[PDB]
Amino acid sequence: NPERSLSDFMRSSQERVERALDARLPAADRMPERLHQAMRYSVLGGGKRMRPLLTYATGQTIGVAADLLDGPACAVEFIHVYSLIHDDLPAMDDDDLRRGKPTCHKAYDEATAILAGDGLQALAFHVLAQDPSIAVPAENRIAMIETLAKASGPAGMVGGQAIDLASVGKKLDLPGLENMHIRKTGALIRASVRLACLARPGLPAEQFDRLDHYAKCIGLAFQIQDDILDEESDTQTLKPNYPALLGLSGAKEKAEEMHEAALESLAGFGPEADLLRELARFIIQRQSAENLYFQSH
Amino acid sequence: ERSLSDFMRSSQERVERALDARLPAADRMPERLHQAMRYSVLGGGKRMRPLLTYATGQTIGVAADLLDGPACAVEFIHVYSLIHDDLPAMDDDDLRRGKPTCHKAYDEATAILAGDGLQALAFHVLAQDPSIAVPAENRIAMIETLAKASGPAGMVGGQAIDLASVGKKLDLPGLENMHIRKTGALIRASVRLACLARPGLPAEQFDRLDHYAKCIGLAFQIQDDILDEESDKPNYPALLGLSGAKEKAEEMHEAALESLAGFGPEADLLRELARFIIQRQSAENLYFQ
Structure with a gap:
């Protein structure tokens, strides 16, 4: 079934990208040392790897060997991580913690x-x-x-x-x-998909466009869902957002509509796109890697 | 072949139009970001890196039309590093070249x-x-x-x-x-970008111009330290003696000019630029403080 295939694909791609990032990051014991270790501290040791998963899953769908995709997958992930480090700084989002681990500026210093x-x-x-x-x-x-x-x-x-x-x-x-x-989050998600497309020489323009539309729709939908879970959290316990603007039902319907448009973008593909069909649901519903594991096994 | 002053004037004006044309408009969203980028880039600067790009171009017969994009790319990187270096976490400057810095004209986030x-x-x-x-x-x-x-x-x-x-x-x-890493690399890039705009340029010409770039970069930095020492972090006069450092500055200057071996009046601009970069552009923020 495609959900077990997704879970297998996820676990495997996350290990493959972990090694590919390590291979492209300058060594912890080479000069400058503190700088190299700070980059490695932020990049390595897991994370959802959503953008690489999109690169690898898109490549598999259009028949690009994974060897051609390691580089582009690391490139988008480097960009993603760099944005996190800077966004976590005092003058911006001022995050002191990230993934049960102190942030780069806390763990080192702001200059580093x-x-x-x-x-x-x-x-x-x-x-x-x-x-x-x-x-x-x-x-x-x-x-x-x-x-x-x-x-x-x-x-x-x-x-x-x-x-x-x-x-x-x-x-x-x-x-x-x-x-x-679309600008803050969407552009880099769509880049992850487009990079894979560019590793397929001569891929028809219609396939670029559909997969880009898939990418655009999942990017919008998951952040709508982030807001929904946030809204539900504080209104069930003792900045502009989607449920404030539209109501909770309007926000729910908007995410659902985007989710539908994502799946319809894939009509130009057969069962080779089942991976993207399942990945759409996983990303949009904000499910964890382990939650996906303990319900497909 | 014209004078260095003519080249300096021409190139300063050219790189300004070229940078303006590649910077997103002040009146387009996100406006504040666009204005802040334009503030730091168009606010001033010696434009040493674009000067090298254009002068390398002339020396090897590349049209300046091919060089506007490369000269802008190196200048954008240089300007970015200054914005970030000027921040309170780094060097903490409120002013640069007699104007307020980016994070002071705007804010730190911006x-x-x-x-x-x-x-x-x-x-x-x-x-x-x-x-x-x-x-x-x-x-x-x-x-x-x-x-x-x-x-x-x-x-x-x-x-x-x-x-x-x-x-x-x-x-x-x-x-x-x-x-060599901090400032030398980007200076070498300014020159190498121009060489790559000449299809089929022999490796020996790449290397001559690179060696010129590497040595002027070091000579400028040694001369900066000599000038710092003479009017009152590791530095050349402290490590070598003032005499040792002056001698090393001299040797670097000569090695840079040796690299331009055999060029005709064709490399007069690069020779004149080296004399200018090492001696005048090094005694600058010391001159006006």
Whole structure:
């Protein structure tokens, strides 16, 4: 059944990316040591690896060997981690903890955190430009770099964080709240999918577009669901969001509608896309890796 | 062939138009971020890195139209590192070149992001800018050059070595290594980017120009320290003696000019730039304080 296949695929890909990140991170005992260990502290030792899973799952769907996908999967994950390190800083989200573990600025210092994030961003692009295992044509490699730069920069992830900070005391409309999430979170999720597509020479434009629409819809849907679980949490115990804007039922319906559009994007694929069908549900419903395990086994 | 002053004026004005054209508009969302990026980039600067790019271009027969994108990409990286270096966690500067710094004109969050955004944008320029009309392999090598120069083994790692060396003494190799990474890599990249805009340029010309770049970078840094010592962290005069350091500055200057072997009046601009970078551009924030 596809749910056990998803669980198997997840566990295996998370181990494969863990080794691939370690192989691309400069050694803990080489100079500069504190900087290298700070990057490694933030990148390694697990995490959901949602963006790599999207890269690996997309590649398997369109028939790209996983060897060609290690580089792009690490590149998107480096970008993701760099954004976390900087976002956790006092001047932004000011997080003291991340995954039962002190954050990079707490565990080291703020200067080391700023630099580890800076170094991870540059390293993402070094992986795409130079990694020989990304054995694709020159044009494709260039397109991957452009993809990551557009997704990570002021028109993507960074600008989305700027929009998020500028709206802390504000009430946004639906298109306004969506736009922010599309930039802050959506662009890098869609990049993860597009990178895999670019490792398939000659892949039809219609397949790019459908898988991009799949990527866009799951990105929007899961953050709507994040808000729903948040709203349900504080109203069952003793910043603009989706249930505040739409009501809880309106927010629930909006996520469901996005979820439907995600699955319909995959109509151009057969059972090779079952993995993406199951991954959509897992990501959107915010299920844990172990919860997925103890119900499919 | 024209004077260095003519080249300086021309290039300063050219790089300003070129950087403006690659920076997202102030009146487009997210406006504050765009304005903050523009503030730091267009606010001023010696433009040493774009000068080298354009001058390398002239020396090897590349049209300046091919060099606008590379000159902007290196300048974007340089400007990003300053925004981040100026922060309270790092060097903590309220002012730079007689204007307030990024996080003071805006705020610290906006500064972190303005820097983050400029690093992404430098790669976006190299990967996509159509004016960099070079074959695909050359464009990819430009991107690799920039990423190796800007990352953990270049600029960023150099700043890490610098910060980790406070309250410490370093040997000569270590102090050299620190500067070669921190500032040398990006300077070498400015020159190498121009070389990659000349398809089929022999490796020997790459290496001559690289050696020129490496030695001027070190000479500038040694000269900075000499000038710091002369008016009142590891440094050259403290490690070698003032005489030792002056001699090393001299040797680096000469080695940089030796690399330009055999060029005709063709490399007069690079010779003049080295004299200018080492002697005038080093005695600068000392001149006006």
